Assembly symmetry: D2
Homo-oligomer: 258 residues x 4
Amino acid sequence: VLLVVHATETARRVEKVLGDNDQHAADGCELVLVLGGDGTFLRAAELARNASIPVLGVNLGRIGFLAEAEAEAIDAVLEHVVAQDYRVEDRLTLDVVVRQGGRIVNRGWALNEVSLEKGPRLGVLGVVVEIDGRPVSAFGCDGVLVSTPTGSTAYAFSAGGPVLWPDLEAILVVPNNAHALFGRPMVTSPEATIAIEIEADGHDALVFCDGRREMLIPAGSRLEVTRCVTSVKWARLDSAPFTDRLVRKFRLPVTGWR
Amino acid sequence: AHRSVLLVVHTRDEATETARRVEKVLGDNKIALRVLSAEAVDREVVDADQHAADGCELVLVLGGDGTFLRAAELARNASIPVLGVNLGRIGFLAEAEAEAIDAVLEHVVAQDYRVEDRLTLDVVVRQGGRIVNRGWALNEVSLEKGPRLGVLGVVVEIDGRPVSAFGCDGVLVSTPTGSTAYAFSAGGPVLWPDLEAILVVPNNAHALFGRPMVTSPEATIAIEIEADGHDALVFCDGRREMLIPAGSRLEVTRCVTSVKWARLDSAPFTDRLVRKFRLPVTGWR
Amino acid sequence: TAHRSVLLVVHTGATETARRVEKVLGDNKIALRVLSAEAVDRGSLHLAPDDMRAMGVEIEVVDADQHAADGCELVLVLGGDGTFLRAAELARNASIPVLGVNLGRIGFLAEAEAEAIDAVLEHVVAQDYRVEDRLTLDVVVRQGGRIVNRGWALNEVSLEKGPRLGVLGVVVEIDGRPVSAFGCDGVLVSTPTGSTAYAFSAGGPVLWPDLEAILVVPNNAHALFGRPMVTSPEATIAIEIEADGHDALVFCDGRREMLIPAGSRLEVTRCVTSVKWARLDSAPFTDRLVRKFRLPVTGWR
Amino acid sequence: HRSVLLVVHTATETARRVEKVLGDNKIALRVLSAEAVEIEVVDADQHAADGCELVLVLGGDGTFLRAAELARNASIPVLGVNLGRIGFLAEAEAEAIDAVLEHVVAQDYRVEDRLTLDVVVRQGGRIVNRGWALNEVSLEKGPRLGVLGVVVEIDGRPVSAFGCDGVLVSTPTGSTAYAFSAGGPVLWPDLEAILVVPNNAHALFGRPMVTSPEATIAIEIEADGHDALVFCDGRREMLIPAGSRLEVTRCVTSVKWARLDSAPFTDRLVRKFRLPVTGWR
């Protein structure tokens, strides 16, 4: 067990029960356990990625979407860490390439969001969004989010997208502040290719993945996002349903229900 | 025994050039046309009343989107594929336009076309535990306020836990295919026709969260009609109506009986979306 | 001859705070009006002059029949938003202030709740409230060139599609020129006051009550642009209902209904005579919004 | 002596005809390039129009804004003529340059005050920066990543607190621009109101508010986050200290807008957005 953390000192009760029984290639292990927030989980996934092992997440501070257990139950988790018994479920991951003159110049991955974004703070990004080899819209905007159903709850939600339950397989596209009549979010089979075409004449742009790995989009290039061949592995427990998490998260009213 | 095709036509246009061309081709090939009596009453050729016209291999539809949907009600019955040709306006469901009629007919005859099972929804109105009506939809199930003024108390439940209680004009539960229709009007996202998912769009919900939700094809969406209020209504495909009683419960699920759609060498969904909505697409690659 | 009159309006069936009106309104030599309906049933549970003089209250001038009838100082609705809208109804004829006390649910238009009717009534007596003109709308229906029905609204004018199925085709024109043609469920021409109601539901932004503007929110427009539009107070919204389609209906303030024939034309304009709203030291519109939508507000000064 | 500042984007046929007619008529011409005695070429300077009777602009909306800046600083009218593109802000299009010039010479055009927003950055009781806007104050996330903490307040009373990319406070003229991009409703430019539009707010109520033009819109910047930016009319930047309080009110002296016999807004709107309009009347 790699253990990534951070009142965050239930950190010790983890090392207690585990011994009872440098970040980059820091994988080597069989499981990653994270004690922290949604952001921390995204961080651990980074690490679990390269030597494809499961991730598990324990919610210390706030209330998020990814962690599979509360803090005040860190023991009932350890039992399962020992027991090796949890179902590990593969989850849709996005693959992104950046291509100039037909040639792949940069490449990345996300489990929440590929967020192509304006370069200069002032002005707009000309972009042509493309779906399965055909164009759907040209407009200027702050960027385009290409999102996973897990990620459909993060930034893409802020950009105004719909909420996708986490066990669905789809790719979500939410144009981010598009100056245009149809800036409607679009949803697409997991088999599809979203390509966005940065304006040749304009300035360079950025992409961000899981709000943490940055790339540089040269003017005139092409982002291709498709479903990735090697998913992220998620530990799963007797956690609450996504539905319950959405409800808690957003204090959604639910009185009157049978 | 013989082959037969059922032809469903909008009714008068260059809808007659096309109909006659259909009567011609199948005639030449010993395939019997069959038409709907009302349609044949403003002028081999059998003539059926409109309930279950089957015995046929294909339902050929000449007209537009709303027409396709009538045709599919007819096809659902004997579960036979439907194929649509556009006459006047621009739609999402036809696989060709009249100006390519002759070519379709080569396919109608050869029967060489692909037949996809497009996702279909299954609805049950349940009261007191006991199912009191059922329906199905290929586009949308539209739960809607009964009386014109007032609001409809609703709780939306997804996979067995409640997601939201509000008042609204209604709730749409939509097929990817139906995301283009009423759901779009009500604020929904466009979903691509091949995706298998389920879309929920609260209709005119007076409340903060009325986001579209999208769900995998295996989910159950249930909507509980406020007991004390008035009876609601559900509409499937803007054609079949069920009276939802106050206090009942509506479950929508993926149907096991897909509508068979007869597929051709046609435009991608993207292109059709662009055409319909005049989407600005200059500058592309 | 010379005299002080005050119209009670109530939601019949805490309606006895209504007699607390009838008490206090008497010892002050006021009025207490009531309508036909208001005094053929409850609300006037104590309907009798055998109670209205035993109270020392030259009170109950039931005389008043509903609508185009009366010359008072104020209208005092106890009831809800529903009812304030009723009262406003009448009052608009007489062109006089409306003051609403809230029995049940929290409303946007009520100046107080019943646990206060004591103080409320004290301010009524003293005439020491504030009056304030809220924007009111005027709607006409015009067919074959000429007016063929007319209406008015304080909240919304809701043009709604007639038959249950299919869709209503509509061209929306603002100050003379067309702005969007689409099929929809309808179109809301709303007041700032009314942007809280159906218009909100239908996606409109929230407008502060004092603002002077007109809000247009296409209801479920099947179109890329069905944004809400906000227009100056003196614009003219016109919606032409398509000819080949069906008739339609409009409702003003969720009550005064009008049939809108196919091919006719709706024109909404600000009305010359605003409704007048009696106003106390009450919550600003901000706090009402924060309460009725339960808005997250914290980490502030 | 009468004088006019001409702001052209740098296109020449129009520019020449202006040079021409204002010569023939004894009006001094100051030319300023927008990228940046009978005629002068003037440096880009906030005081360029300080003596002129009018600012005339050839170009689209972005240029109008640059010109408006100057006209505001010299407290005189601006007038725009469109060149290449379609805009909301010009009063006439290049082909009608002659007619326009005639009015320029004549000084017979209506000049209407148009609502302008005044913005202040206040911190600990002192006002520590300030600005104005004719389109929008755009309060924005400082760091490219992360969200910005915000509490939005109307006449002293809080209305919402959420994380966001920023908050737009917009002028009705403005409602057509970035505000529109952000989800805003469209506002007729004669209307006098202030529009608030949250920008990518991770919350259920991100709904546009529209406020009487006497309101005080304030925004309190989370004391624990990073600095934020504010941009005005897509062009005048201001650093916003963490913990401070933005305030936007209607400015006392507004921008003067020369008017003319132009298309009504409704048309402008239909023109830009290619709004479907068939079957009318």
